[PDB]
Amino acid sequence: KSLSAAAQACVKKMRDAKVNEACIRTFIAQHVMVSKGETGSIPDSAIMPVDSLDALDSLTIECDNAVLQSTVVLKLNGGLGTGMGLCDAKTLLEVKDGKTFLDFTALQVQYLRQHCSEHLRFMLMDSFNTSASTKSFLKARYPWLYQVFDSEVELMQNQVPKILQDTLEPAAWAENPAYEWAPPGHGDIYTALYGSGKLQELVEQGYRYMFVSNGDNLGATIDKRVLAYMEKEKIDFLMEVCRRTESDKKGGHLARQTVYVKGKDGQPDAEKRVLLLRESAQCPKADMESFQDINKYSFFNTNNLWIRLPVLLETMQEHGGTLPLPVIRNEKTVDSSNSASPKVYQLETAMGAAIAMFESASAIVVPRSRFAPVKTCADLLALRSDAYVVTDDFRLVLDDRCHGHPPVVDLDSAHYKMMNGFEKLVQHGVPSLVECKRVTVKGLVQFGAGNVLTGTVTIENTDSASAFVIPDGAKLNDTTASP
Numbered sequence: 001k002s003l004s005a006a007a008q009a010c011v012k013k014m015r016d017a018k019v020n021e022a023c024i025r026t027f028i029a030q031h032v033m034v035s036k037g038e039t040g041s042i043p044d045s046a047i048m049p050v051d052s053l054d055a056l057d058s059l060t061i062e063c064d065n066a067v068l069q070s071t072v073v074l075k076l077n078g079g080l081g082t083g084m085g086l087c088d089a090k091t092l093l094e095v096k097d098g099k100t101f102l103d104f105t106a107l108q109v110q111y112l113r114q115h116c117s118e119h120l121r122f123m124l125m126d127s128f129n130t131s132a133s134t135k136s137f138l139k140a141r142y143p144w145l146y147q148v149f150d151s152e153v154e155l156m157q158n159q160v161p162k163i164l165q166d167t168l169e170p171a172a173w174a175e176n177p178a179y180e181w182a183p184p185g186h187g188d189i190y191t192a193l194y195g196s197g198k199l200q201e202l203v204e205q206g207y208r209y210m211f212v213s214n215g216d217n218l219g220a221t222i223d224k225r226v227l228a229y230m231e232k233e234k235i236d237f238l239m240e241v242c243r244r245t246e247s248d249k250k251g252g253h254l255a256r257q258t259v260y261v262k263g264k265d266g267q268p269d270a271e272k273r274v275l276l277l278r279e280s281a282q283c284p285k286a287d288m289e290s291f292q293d294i295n296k297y298s299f300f301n302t303n304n305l306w307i308r309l310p311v312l313l314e315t316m317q318e319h320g321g322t323l324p325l326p327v328i329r330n331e332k333t334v335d336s337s338n339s340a341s342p343k344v345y346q347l348e349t350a351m352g353a354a355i356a357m358f359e360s361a362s363a364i365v366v367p368r369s370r371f372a373p374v375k376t377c378a379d380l381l382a383l384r385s386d387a388y389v390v391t392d393d394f395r396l397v398l399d400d401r402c403h404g405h406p407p408v409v410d411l412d413s414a415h416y417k418m419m420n421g422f423e424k425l426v427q428h429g430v431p432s433l434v435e436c437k438r439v440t441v442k443g444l445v446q447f448g449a450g451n452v453l454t455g456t457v458t459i460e461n462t463d464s465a466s467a468f469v470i471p472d473g474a475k476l477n478d479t480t481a482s483p
């Protein structure tokens with residue numbers, strides 16, 4: 001087949017494991033790229049900034065309900081609560097009043113079906129680690145989703161072999177063979193949608209738009225103005241971006257790029273401009289300063305994506321049933337825990353990289369309320385507090401008294417990085433944070449019932465086994481509370 005021996009081993013291992021062919025072809029193409037010594041480097045000289053974009057806040061027109069009848073909501077749901085020390089699906093974490101991220105999405109989907117469109121489709125992208133727990137919760141709480149879980153709801157993320165850095169052969173780890181496999185990033189969504197046969201079914205049933213976002217980003221809700229905008233401007237791929245701030249300077253940014261493409265067979269040569277994403281790893285060392293200049297590059301990807309399904313099907317068909325995204329070459333050991341285990345590459349792609357694959361690709365600036373991932377227990381504390389309220393359509397929004405500014409929460413990593421320690425801290429209640437500008441917690445602390453915080457509050461305890469407990473009903477305003 002003219003493959004490399006290393007590549008042939010990967011094909012054999014993936015075929016033995018009954019990996020679908022669309023995943024194999026995608027992976028082999030990436031394998032060939034890495035065989036060629038592909039850097040992935042994106043020098044500043046290869047890009048230009050984006051200075052102007054339309055803003056969601058400036059938009060007003062809502063699409064009609066017919067558009068929603070042709071819309072699929074897809075939530076990424078492969079992540080575990082690893083960061084929180086959790087070892088199961090992050091979307092099953094209680095966010096507010098006994099509801100999870102998954103409750104809120106399902107309630108939102110149900111609200112739109114009841115009031116706007118019954119045909120609105122809901123999908124979840126699962127991994128092997130989240131599938132079962134995602135099924136039983138739906139079984140327990142949303143039977144209408146459970147009945148069609150396998151047929152309509154679930155999209156299974158592929159797994160691909162980790163390869164040895166020196167030979168590019170499939171790594172072997174007899175101690176735990178599962179460590180021989182790894183997910184391919186959220187870029188896999190296209191490979192999964194196509195390969196599983198789902199992309200075509202959705203198009204065949206007449207679905208036109210898919211809205212993709214993180215399961216743990218409660219800000220990412222259907223906005224009918226975005227659908228109108230895509231209809232009006234004939235957009236095939238829309239990326240919601242946010243303004244970059246000092247805290248964001250290490251994250252990726254949007255950029256412009258001018259490409260010239262050689263025509264294949266009877267096609268003319270084409271010079272066009274594309275949008276793209278640049279990450280820290282892809283950025284060369286000398287431009288790092290440039291990379292962190294928020295004024296120069298001012299937008300970052302939220303992973304809130306809006307895609308025209310028929311064009312996606314088309315584009316992937318023209319590329320041989322695949323989508324050629326930039327390959328990220330994760331450097332690890334087969335066992336992350338064992339530094340002496342064989343060094344490997346894990347090949348992955350970013351679903352946001354697809355913005356460069358469409359001629360009618362655009363980006364729109366959205367407020368940061370649409371980018372509210374819960375990455376820490378600090379984020380979780382804010383959400384649970386009375387700073388956030390639940391709308392009629394089951395959205396989570398800041399109370400009006402916050403004036404669009406959420407409370408800044410800094411929890412001591414030594415005790416509250418784990419859900420274990422964090423649930424002790426709020427064991428007797430969640431303090432009122434609606435009026436608090438900033439709360440900082442150092443050392444071991446427990447809130448009392450009825451605590452109310454305003455202004456800038458620090459709660460600081462010096463002795464490690466103390467267990468400093470705030471009195472019930474205590475109100476702290478602009479102060480530092482020590483024992």
Ligand SMILES: N[C@@H](Cc1ccccc1)C(=O)O
Binds near residue numbers: 244366367404
């Ligand atoms: N306008 C956003 C603030 C913001 C916008 C864009 C990027 C970053 C922050 C809000 O108030 O929610």
